[PDB]
Structures are given as structure tokens and as C-alpha cells.
Amino acid sequence: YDKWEMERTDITMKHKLGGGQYGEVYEGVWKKYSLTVAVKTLKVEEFLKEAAVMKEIKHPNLVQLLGVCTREPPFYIITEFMTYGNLLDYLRECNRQEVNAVVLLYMATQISSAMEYLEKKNFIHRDLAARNCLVGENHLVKVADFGLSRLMTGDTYTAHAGAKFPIKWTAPESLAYNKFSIKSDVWAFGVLLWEIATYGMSPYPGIDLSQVYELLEKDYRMERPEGCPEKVYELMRACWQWNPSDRPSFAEIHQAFETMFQES
Amino acid sequence: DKWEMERTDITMKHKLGGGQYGEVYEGVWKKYSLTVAVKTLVEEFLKEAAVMKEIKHPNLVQLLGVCTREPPFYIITEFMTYGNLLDYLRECNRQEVNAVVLLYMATQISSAMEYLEKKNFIHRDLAARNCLVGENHLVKVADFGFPIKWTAPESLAYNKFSIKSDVWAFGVLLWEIATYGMSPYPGIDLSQVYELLEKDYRMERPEGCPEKVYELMRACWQWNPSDRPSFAEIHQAFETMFQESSISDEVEKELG
Numbered sequence: 001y002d003k004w005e006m007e008r009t010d011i012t013m014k015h016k017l018g019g020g021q022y023g024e025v026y027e028g029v030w031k032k033y034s035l036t037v038a039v040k041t042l043k044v045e046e047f048l049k050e051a052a053v054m055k056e057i058k059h060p061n062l063v064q065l066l067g068v069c070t071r072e073p074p075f076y077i078i079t080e081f082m083t084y085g086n087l088l089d090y091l092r093e094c095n096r097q098e099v100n101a102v103v104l105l106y107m108a109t110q111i112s113s114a115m116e117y118l119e120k121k122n123f124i125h126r127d128l129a130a131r132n133c134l135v136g137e138n139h140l141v142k143v144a145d146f147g148l149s150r151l152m153t154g155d156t157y158t159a160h161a162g163a164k165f166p167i168k169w170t171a172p173e174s175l176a177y178n179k180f181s182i183k184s185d186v187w188a189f190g191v192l193l194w195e196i197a198t199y200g201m202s203p204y205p206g207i208d209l210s211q212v213y214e215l216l217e218k219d220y221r222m223e224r225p226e227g228c229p230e231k232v233y234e235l236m237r238a239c240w241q242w243n244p245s246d247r248p249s250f251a252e253i254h255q256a257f258e259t260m261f262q263e264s
Numbered sequence: 265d266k267w268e269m270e271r272t273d274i275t276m277k278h279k280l281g282g283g284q285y286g287e288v289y290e291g292v293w294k295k296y297s298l299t300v301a302v303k304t305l306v307e308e309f310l311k312e313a314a315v316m317k318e319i320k321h322p323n324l325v326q327l328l329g330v331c332t333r334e335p336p337f338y339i340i341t342e343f344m345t346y347g348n349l350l351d352y353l354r355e356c357n358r359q360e361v362n363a364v365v366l367l368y369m370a371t372q373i374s375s376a377m378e379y380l381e382k383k384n385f386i387h388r389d390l391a392a393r394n395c396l397v398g399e400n401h402l403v404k405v406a407d408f409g410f411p412i413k414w415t416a417p418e419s420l421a422y423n424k425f426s427i428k429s430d431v432w433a434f435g436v437l438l439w440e441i442a443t444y445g446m447s448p449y450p451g452i453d454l455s456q457v458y459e460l461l462e463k464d465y466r467m468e469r470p471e472g473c474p475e476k477v478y479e480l481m482r483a484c485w486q487w488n489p490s491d492r493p494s495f496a497e498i499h500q501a502f503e504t505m506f507q508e509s510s511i512s513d514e515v516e517k518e519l520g
């Protein structure tokens with residue numbers, strides 16, 4: 001038992017979070033601080049592996065591990081809870097006069113800050129998308145990883161290379177040679193930018209999944225969304241360079257957003 | 265008991281706040297050279313003193329001593345540097361008292377109310393005019409002594425007051441905070457509020473009010489008292505929002 005271990009009686013377990021939307025994840029209360037928390041429970045090696053990964057990740061714009069319960073079953077991974085839930089549904093339901101262009105810019109900047117951190121620490125996300133981000137009060141955004149390919153139904157994830165892929169977020173080299181890297185995260189980030197700019201539309205709208213790889217390899221790219229600033233679209237296109245090594249680093253992306261934000 | 269002190273331990277100065285609080289005066293607790301507030305004057309007075317000996321919380325006005333042997337009687341509390349919350353909202357600089365501070369103030373009040381809920385006390389007059397402000401936007405709930413606009417439906421129709429009617433009033437207090445101290449139900453004839461509430465009219469979201477704050481307002485204004493959240497739930501939602509807003513505020517400063 002290490003410094004992250006917490007007594008199970010420190011947490012009030014309330015109910016499954018989102019009625020099963022996230023699997024075996026419960027809304028709870030960290031009683032001594034009056035804080036709502038999220039608690040992932042084991043219905044085993046992968047579970048503890050996820051916990052060990054999260055002990056190494058500490059950044060304002062990444063989901064923060066608060067504690068674990070590993071003394072007897074069921075095992076717990078406890079994180080902060082984010083008031084407004086996932087970013088995709090938030091964008092689709094928000095007041096767009098309230099969540100306006102400067103807020104969208106602010107959300108993109110925080111996500112690039114989180115990815116710059118993972119880049120610095122040699123992590124790969126592998127499933128970056130709006131559905132894996134969370135929104136808090138005062139336009140806080142945190143990047144998470146809910147393990148959604150198992151949980152979500154529909155066409156978002158589809159069978160490919162004997163696995164489940166979000167085809168429309170997946171970099172070419174990952175689709176073709178099953179190669180994943182920080183640069184394939186940059187590609188997905190470009191798609192996430194487009195999700196943000198369209199307030200959560202599905203990417204390549206109206207284009208069948210069967211066409212996506214061929215179109216990309218023949219240099220098709222999504223058009224600039226209505227109202228999207230040209231400089232932001234330039235960034236999207238740099239994220240979608242066919243050669244991973246031609247894509248910018250997250251350090252460069254965040255610097256560019258930083259400059260843009262203070263000029264607003 | 266420990267609370268009894270002599271009337272001569274305290275130098276009584278002029279009445280406080282133009283008497284708007286009644287017979288409450290600025291005083292000085294001599295032994296500590298400390299400015300204090302002193303309420304002076306049936307046995308309601310002594311009931312209030314007895315209650316305040318049972319209350320201790322960061323965001324509830326702190327009793328310091330009592331004089332309950334021979335008239336005139338004293339209830340002595342700490343003195344709060346910045347006066348009552350309603351005037352503070354109405355006169356403040358909104359660039360300094362911004363959305364992060366308004367959230368901090370609501371969080372502090374919900375914590376005081378969770379504490380009263382846990383002790384089985386009922387406030388019965390929660391409103392911004394009954395809160396006090398100290399340094400660093402510290403807020404404490406007090407009770408100075410119907411306000412139809414703050415009064416829950418079952419209190420209006422049946423004279424039933426409970427912690428859940430305090431929850432209703434807290435929702436109205438949130439709206440006071442969110443509007444920097446506007447009067448609730450703008451322009452609406454107070455004599456028609458009960459029937460309006462019965463037919464599911466509620467105040468609209470104020471300009472700039474966060475959506476989860478308004479959702480909590482509307483939960484506080486559920487018609488059935490059992491459908492309203494507890495103050496433990498409300499306080500938990502606000503501490504959770506407040507931590508998010510503090511992190512974001514730091515991220516935004518770091519960008520500049």
C-alpha cells in the first residue's frame with residue numbers, strides 16, 4: 001500500500017455515473033473535503049496498470065487521480081469529478097452566445113497544454129477526442145481517457161485490424177500500419193479542433209467510413225468550418241500532414257494558441 | 265458559564281449601521297482592545313443567546329460573550345469589517361468581485377447551511393441582507409431579525425418551515441448574488457407570487473449566471489420540499505465547482 005491508498009470509508013458511493021454510460025464508474029463524495037468524485041470499480045492487471053499510469057500524471061488540464069482502494073475487492077480508482085461532464089455533449093448543448101469564440105479558443109489552448117505535458121513525459125494518449133474531455137466551472141477543460149471503445153455503441157468505433165477504432169479520428173499510419181505515437185495524437189487533436197469549431201458535429205459529415213482512408217491518402221481534408229478563424233484552420237491543416245514528422249509538436253501548438261489568446 | 269462576562273468589560277460606542285439592525289452597537293472588548301458588535305435590550309433574547317452558544321463554524325457569525333444576569337442584556341459577536349452582503353454586492357467593484365468571487369461567496373454560505381442542517385437547526389430568514397463580509401471576501405451567515413420573495417410555498421400556505429424551506433431561500437439568495445443584489449421577481453406583484461409558483465413560474469436565469477448554478481437554483485425551487493437537494497448536496501456541488509473555477513483562474517493567469 002503506497003501514499004495513494006485511501007480508506008474506503010472516506011468515500012460515500014452514491015450511484016453509477018450516468019446510468020452506465022461510463023461502465024463501472026460511480027459518482028461519490030470525498031467526505032472530509034465535501035468534494036464530488038468519480039470512482040471506477042473493478043467488476044485486474046490492466047486496472048492496476050491504469051492506476052500506476054495516473055500516479056505519474058499531474059497537470060491542471062488532465063484528470064487528476066485522488067486515491068485508490070486496493071486492500072480488498074472491489075478495487076477503486078478515485079478521480080476528481082467535473083461539473084459539466086464530457087466536452088462533446090457540452091458543445092452540443094451549450095449556449096453559444098455564452099460559449100463564444102474566445103471560450104472555444106480557451107478550451108483548445110487548455111487541451112494543447114495537457115497534450116504538451118503528455119508529450120514532455122513520453123506518453124501517448126491514443127484516443128484523443130471531445131468525448132474523452134471533461135468540462136468544469138469557469139470553462140475548465142481536462143483531458144481524460146474513459147476506455148470508450150468498449151463502452152460506446154454505434155458507429156464511433158468500428159472493427160478494424162481486429163480491434164475497435166474511431167476511424168474518423170485515426171491518423172493514416174495508425175489505420176494502415178497500426179503505428180501510434182505522439183504525432184498520431186496531433187492528428188486526432190486536429191480533428192478535436194474541428195469538433196470544437198463546429199460545436200460538436202460528427203467529422204467528415206455525410207461521408208461513409210468506407211471512403212475515409214482513400215480520401216485522406218488522396219489529400220482530401222475537411223474544409224474550414226463556418227466561423228472558424230483562418231489561423232486556427234491553418235493549425236488544423238498542419239495537424240493533418242500525411243507524414244507524422246511534418247506535423248507540429250504539441251509544444252508548438254500550445255505556443256501558437258498562447259500567442260492567439262493574449263492577442264484576443 | 266464560560267460565556268458570561270461583565271457589562272463593564274465592554275465599552276459601548278454608537279449604534280451600528282444607522283440603527284438598521286436595531287439595538288446593535290459598536291463596542292470595544294477592553295481586555296483585548298477589540299472592536300465587537302453588541303446586541304442589547306424578552307426571553308427570546310436568552311433563547312437566541314442559548315442557541316448561539318451551540319453554533320461554531322467558519323461561516324457563521326461567532327458569539328464572543330453574553331451578559332444575561334441583570335438588564336441591560338448583551339449578546340456580543342465578532343465585528344465584520346465590510347458590513348452586510350447585500351450592500352456589499354450593490355456597491356462593489358465588479359471587476360474585483362467577479363464570477364470566481366461570487367462563486368466563493370455562494371460556497372461559503374452553503375457550507376454554513378450544511379452545518380445548520382447537520383445540527384438540526386432551521387434558519388427561517390436566509391437572504392443576502394442577513395450575511396456579513398470580512399477580509400478576503402469572507403462571508404458569514406447571521407440572523408438580524410414574511411419576506412414573501414424568499415419564502416417557500418409550503419411556508420406561505422401552511423406556515424411550515426424546515427431546512428428545506430431554507431433551501432428554497434438559498435436559491436433566492438443565489439439569484440441575489442448573481443445579480444449583484446437586485447430585488448427578486450422584478451416588477452411582479454408580491455400578492456400573486458404564490459399562485460405563480462404553483463403554476464410553475466420561476467425566475468429566469470440571470471445574465472452571466474453559470475448554467476450549473478442556475479440548475480441548482482431551480483432545484484432549490486422545486487415545489488415539493490422533498491424534491492429539493494440537501495445543503496450537503498448543495499455544498500458538495502459548490503466546492504466541486506469552486507475547485508474547477510480556481511484551477512481555471514490560475515490557468516488563465518498563467519497564459520498572460
Ligand SMILES: Cc1ccc(NC(=O)c2ccc(CN3CCN(C)CC3)cc2)cc1Nc1nccc(-c2cccnc2)n1
Nearest residue numbers: 022025038039040063077079081082085124125126144145
Ligand atoms: C474514475 C476515473 C478513473 C480513471 C480515469 N482514467 C483516465 O481518465 C485516464 C486519463 C489519462 C490516462 C493516460 N493514458 C496513458 C496513455 N494511454 C495509451 C492511455 C491514456 C489514463 C487514464 C478517469 C476517471 N474519471 C472518470 N471516468 C469516467 C467519467 C468521469 C466523469 C464523468 C462526468 C463528470 N466527471 C467525471 N470521470
Ligand SMILES: Cc1ccc(NC(=O)c2ccc(CN3CCN(C)CC3)cc2)cc1Nc1nccc(-c2cccnc2)n1
Nearest residue numbers: 285288301302303339341343344347385386387388406407
Ligand atoms: C450582535 C449580534 C447578536 C446576535 C446575532 N445573532 C445571529 O446572527 C444569529 C445567527 C444565527 C442564529 C441561529 N438561529 C437558529 C434558529 N433560527 C430560527 C434563527 C437562527 C441565531 C442568531 C448576531 C449579532 N451580530 C450582528 N448583528 C447585527 C449586525 C452585526 C454587524 C453589522 C455590521 C458589522 N459587523 C456586525 N452583527
Ligand SMILES: N#CCC(=O)Nc1nc(-c2ccc(Cl)c(Cl)c2)cs1
Nearest residue numbers: 101104105108193196197226227228
Ligand atoms: N456556430 C458556429 C460555428 C462557429 O462560429 N465556429 C467558431 N469556431 C471558433 C473557434 C475559435 C477558436 C478555436 Cl481554437 C476554434 Cl477550434 C474555434 C470561432 S466561431
Ligand SMILES: N#CCC(=O)Nc1nc(-c2ccc(Cl)c(Cl)c2)cs1
Nearest residue numbers: 363366367370438441442471472473
Ligand atoms: N452582467 C452581469 C452580472 C453577472 O455577470 N452575473 C454573474 N453571476 C455569476 C455567478 C457565478 C457564480 C455564482 Cl455562485 C453566482 Cl450566484 C453567480 C458569474 S457572472
